[PDB]
Amino acid sequence: ADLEDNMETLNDNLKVIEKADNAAQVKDALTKMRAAALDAQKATPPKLEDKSPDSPEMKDFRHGFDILVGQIDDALKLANEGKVKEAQAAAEQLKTTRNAYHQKYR
Ligand code: HEM
């Protein structure tokens, strides 16, 4: 999928997690976010199109998805342990990462 479509998928699932009633809904949503983040990681964002693919900026852009995947893994862990509300609260941290990386590259 392209970068924009993967961003919509992340947004779609963040909202599902916020309104979720059970662990399956939260687990499934985090699972789809993780796959979209990994798909997005291979893209070149518009703002960095004139930089080399291996530049410090492109490496930082890719690192933003490694942070996001780590945060999703932490929330997935809690949801799998039946700590649903804790997983939903943990998922809010993804917004900090979104905000910091959007600030830089969106
Ligand atoms: C849960 C985390 C995130 C959410 C919910 C999110 C959501 C979005 C949304 C809704 C858009 C608008 C475009 C569209 O999808 O139609 C967007 C754009 C974008 N996001 Fe994210 N994002 C997240 C994390 C990140 C991270 C971590 C990065 C960088 C590592 C990033 C980089 C970008 C870029 C570069 C654009 C602009 C793409 C373009 O103009 O084609 N996003 N994001």
Please tell me the distance from the alpha carbon of residue 95 to that of residue 14, in angstroms, as a whole number: 9
Distances (CA, A) of 54 to 45, 88, 95, 101: 13, 35, 27, 18
Query: Is 102 assigned to a binding site?
Result: yes
Query: Is 58 assigned to a binding site?
Result: no
Please tell me the distance from the alpha carbon of residue 61 to that of residue 66, in angstroms, as a whole number: 9
What is the DSSP annotation of 51-89?
S-TTSHHHHHHHHHHHHHHHHHHHHHHHHHTT-HHHHHH
* Residue 10 Cα: closest atom of ligand 1: 5
Question: Residue holding tokens 């949801």?
Answer: 79
Q: Domain range spanning residue 74?
A: 1-106
What is the stated resolution of the deposited model, in angstroms? 1.4
Return the CATH number at 27: 1.20.120.10
Q: How many CA atoms lie within 13 A of 45 on its CB side?
A: 19
Q: How many domains does the chain have?
A: 1
Q: In testing the pocket of ligand 1, which one of 72, 98, 103, 104 has its CB within 8 Å of the most ligand atoms?
A: 98
> Whose alpha carbon is nearest atom 11 of ligand 1?
7
Contact between 58 and 48 (Cβ < 8 Å): yes
Which method resolved this structure? X-ray
The helix/strand count (H/E) of the chain reads as 5, 0
Please tell me the distance from the alpha carbon of residue 100 to that of residue 18, in angstroms, as a whole number: 20
